[PDB]
């Protein structure tokens, strides 16, 4: 919640406007609370001069909460772990997370 790349409950169009306002460079990203799925989050990432959205859904395993973008194939405790991992590893993403909307 205190991270620079987290923008809270902004809209999908606001995320496309914020990313486009800073330039449509590959790797520019932010994380937002989904207004469509209130319990989920979205990683809004610029790739190929296009803003793409990746749904982050919560789930539980042995009563332990985790977040995932691929139905539990890759799991993270919180959003900071998900972002920091994908700054170094592509995963299911088409590129690395390089710059965030401050």
């Amino acid at each position: 919640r205190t991270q620079l790349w987290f923008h809270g409950r902004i809209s999908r169009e606001e995320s496309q406007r914020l990313i486009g306002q800073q330039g449509l460079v590959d790797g520019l990203f932010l994380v937002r609370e989904s207004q469509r799925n209130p319990q989920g989050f979205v990683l809004s990432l610029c790739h190929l001069q296009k803003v793409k959205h990746y749904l982050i859904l919560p789930s539980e395993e042995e009563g332990r909460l985790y977040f995932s973008m691929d139905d539990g194939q890759t799991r993270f405790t919180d959003l900071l772990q998900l972002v920091e991992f994908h700054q170094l590893n592509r995963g299911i993403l088409p590129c690395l997370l390089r710059h965030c909307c401050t």
């Binding site: 469509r36 979205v42 793409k52 959205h53 990746y54 749904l55 859904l57 973008m69 691929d70 299911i92």
Partner: peptide, 8 residues
């Protein structure tokens, strides 16, 4: 896959 989203 999620309708409306780029996940794959």
């Amino acid at each position: 896959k999620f309708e409306g989203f780029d996940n794959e």
